[PDB]
Amino acid sequence: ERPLPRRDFQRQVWLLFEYPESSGPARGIAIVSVLVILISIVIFCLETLPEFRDESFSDPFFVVETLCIIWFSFELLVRFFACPSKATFSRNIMNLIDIVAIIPYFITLGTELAERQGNGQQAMSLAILRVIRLVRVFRIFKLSRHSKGLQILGQTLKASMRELGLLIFFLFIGVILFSSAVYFAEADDPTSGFSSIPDAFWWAVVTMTTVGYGDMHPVTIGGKIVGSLCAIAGVLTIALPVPVIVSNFNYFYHRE
Amino acid sequence: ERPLPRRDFQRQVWLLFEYPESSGPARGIAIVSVLVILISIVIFCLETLPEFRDESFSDPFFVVETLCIIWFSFELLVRFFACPSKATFSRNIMNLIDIVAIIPYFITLGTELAERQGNGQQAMSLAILRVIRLVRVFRIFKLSRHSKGLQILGQTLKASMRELGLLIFFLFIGVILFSSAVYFAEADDPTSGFSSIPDAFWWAVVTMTTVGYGDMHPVTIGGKIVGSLCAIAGVLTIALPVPVIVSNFNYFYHRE
Amino acid sequence: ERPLPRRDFQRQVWLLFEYPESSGPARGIAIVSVLVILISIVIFCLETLPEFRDESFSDPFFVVETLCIIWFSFELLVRFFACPSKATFSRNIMNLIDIVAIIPYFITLGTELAERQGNGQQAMSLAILRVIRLVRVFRIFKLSRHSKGLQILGQTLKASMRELGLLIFFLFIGVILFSSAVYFAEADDPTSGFSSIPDAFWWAVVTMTTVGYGDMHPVTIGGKIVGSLCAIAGVLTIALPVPVIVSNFNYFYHRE
Amino acid sequence: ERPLPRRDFQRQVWLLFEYPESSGPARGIAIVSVLVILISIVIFCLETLPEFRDESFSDPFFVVETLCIIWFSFELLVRFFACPSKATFSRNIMNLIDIVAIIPYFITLGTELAERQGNGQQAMSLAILRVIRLVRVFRIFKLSRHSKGLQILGQTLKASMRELGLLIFFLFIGVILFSSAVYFAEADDPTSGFSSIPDAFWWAVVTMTTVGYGDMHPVTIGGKIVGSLCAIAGVLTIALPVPVIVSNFNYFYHRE
Numbered sequence A, B, C, D: 001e002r003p004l005p006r007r008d009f010q011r012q013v014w015l016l017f018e019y020p021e022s023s024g025p026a027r028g029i030a031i032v033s034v035l036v037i038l039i040s041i042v043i044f045c046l047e048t049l050p051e052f053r054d055e056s057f058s059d060p061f062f063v064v065e066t067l068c069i070i071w072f073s074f075e076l077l078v079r080f081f082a083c084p085s086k087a088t089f090s091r092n093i094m095n096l097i098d099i100v101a102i103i104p105y106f107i108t109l110g111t112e113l114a115e116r117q118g119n120g121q122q123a124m125s126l127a128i129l130r131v132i133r134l135v136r137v138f139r140i141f142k143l144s145r146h147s148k149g150l151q152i153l154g155q156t157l158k159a160s161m162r163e164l165g166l167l168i169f170f171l172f173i174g175v176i177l178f179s180s181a182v183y184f185a186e187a188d189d190p191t192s193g194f195s196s197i198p199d200a201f202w203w204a205v206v207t208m209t210t211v212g213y214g215d216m217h218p219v220t221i222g223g224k225i226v227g228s229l230c231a232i233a234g235v236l237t238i239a240l241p242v243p244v245i246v247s248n249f250n251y252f253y254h255r256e
């Protein structure tokens, strides 16, 4: 188990914010957290449309974000307020997700107020600002608190690291081998889409995995001879470590 | 078992219309029902061609439908006429399929006679009438009475609801994650098909499941780096709960 | 076992033409049959090129066929010459393959000599003559005499007829359902490739099985909503009876 | 086990160059070999770009190759210098990979110096020189010394030769059968991409394996009827001997 605060207000509060099975208020708090997470995801994925892109203070999009960040920060602060051991809090993982999901809103807001008002700046960089906007998407994983499915998935992926390594390794070797073969089989032809070996990598990964987008396909006979072998060998290299991961997931899931 | 009427005419009739193993007439009735269902499906799927679309009373298409509806209604009425318990009849499922397959023909016919003759109407709506035409397709499931395969499938799908939930959940998370990544990796380029994050959802679902229609594919290098990972992760998220459903079906089917 | 002729010449001959494990000559005869089969297949698949198509007596293509038919007929006649029981010969299957592979050459040749010389004819029909040319391809299955793999495959396919029926049935139901849904979701749009429900069948089969050729894909949002579900449900309906057939093949193959 | 030299310098040297678990220097040597292999692969795959292609002595690309070949030759020579039995050295496989990876650099260099200086030559041939450049790619397999994954893969592929034969055989039969059917179903149409049976082979292999590049697809109804059956039968013929190979790999990998 875990220690309990065994006190007057703090123990009651921590049982409220930690165990959704306790009472009516615990279920209410949990549903509130789920609703706010969903709202924030929709806001993030919606503000990127062509229509509102155009070319702050009262915009509809800029409000909702502040409300969601307020609620996340309040929840994190209260949850940390009554926590028995600090070492466990540091060693956890959900708290890392929460703090990472709260950081970017402070950085963006913080950066604009100080610099624009009292300095001349590029932005920072086109790349730097763009990079942050992307990190803002980790709010999905806050649903790990409310579903056993994601936690089972996390444990399965942690247990099976080595097989992931093997799968990527076999894919890499196959990609290099077949890219080289099909580039050299089509150098003499003028009308070929393969300009260099680093350009056939995309074709090799899209053919081994059986997606086959349809651009860059062989035309010479020597090209087709190799494009068949790539298709055949993709299945063989892909399907080797799948049973291990499926077995791990099934055991972790049906365990209880 | 089930109670039997244990009477003079009604018991004989219900044994005729319920158990196709009894006699010659039972087999004849069953084959008649199968023929009529097939005819009705062909009529529904055939009257939609470009040729007879053009821009009622004696049309070839409008007759056959009335005959099929007559036979379905007669069969349902007779089957319900001699039924021991009403609660079982309400709690069943095949009867729901039958009544749902009979409703739309009455609504369409019923609506035209009263309104056109004595009122001015839009139709109802373009959408409303169009919506009903689609519901007319549930006549296929009336074959659940005549094949063990469909009933095995129904039981398997009922038992494995949770794994279906998990599969859709993992797909949804993967879709959002990779759509966001590949939209942000291709914002700077002018010649890109991805205008907004809600526009990359189609690409993500068509790549994770390995269909790969071939429109909307990445062009920048940063786009290709992510389009490879989507292809790899689609297999992993798809192939997790398949063994459970296959095991359920195999057990339900080979049970007897 | 099987009866043996137990005689002077006929028993020796039948042991020569039936059991390739006996002696050196048996192995020589077997290799000769394999070489002739391969030659005939190459001739059939080669005479169809654009170059020799253009718009008989001494053509290179017309000779080789007569030689191969001569050898096949000689082998069949000798094999039947010393056969203990006639009922077994009729009830076999390899002999059916041999006679079916020998028939078309006689029909084509036979038809030209009598009719052209003494009558005026269309050909017979464009379709009739074309149909026969296709039947000429059953010469491949004569390799069932020389590989255990094909015979294992034949036994597996014979044992698992019912699961094949179920697979086709589920595919048919899924095809009709999703074709109807995606035709009705795209009637209002002008620029759609789906003209009628019988036209969406091709899209449904190419999407459920995850080939995805790339013509005929949805454009409206309502179309995409259904095109995702088709992709998901294809895997589910395809992957149900595969384990049974794989188990049958594995048992029949590893049995000995 | 294996014999040990049991001597003063040679035994110490062979333990250094053979067992990376011994000491610090053994780990250093192993990491050096890995770094050099990776460098050489990058050089080979990088010198083929459009930019440095243009239309030796001090080029950046021509140096690095000489350094890598020097190190490979030194390592091979030292490893062979202290080897107990010659028969084992000949019967090994890693040494074959090393000598094959060292040969091409000598041939290319050797050929240019003698012939250009004292003779007039074509090159040798466009094909001959091109063929060698391709063989230069076997440097990847030198990583078999430093990963258990590749060695497990080698043992699995050696054990399962027969199932590979069966898979290719079933694919070949299916390809011929469906190519013939879909060529004859589309001869009458003018606007068809299938000019001859040898031209439909590419379509058959790309459809059976479910890649589906998207050129060459059927247009007539008779063509679509067969293009569906090809898609269905590809899964059946592909998925038969996969369980055997997966079982072999799993046993060899989880053995220890």
Ligand SMILES: [K+]
Pocket (backbone or CB within 6 Å): A210, A211, B210, B211, C210, C211, D210, D211
């Ligand atoms: K696929």
Ligand SMILES: [K+]
Pocket (backbone or CB within 6 Å): A211, A212, A213, A214, B211, B212, B213, B214, C211, C212, C213, C214, D211, D212, D213, D214
């Ligand atoms: K495709």
Ligand SMILES: [K+]
Pocket (backbone or CB within 6 Å): A210, A211, A212, B210, B211, B212, C210, C211, C212, D210, D211, D212
């Ligand atoms: K595909």
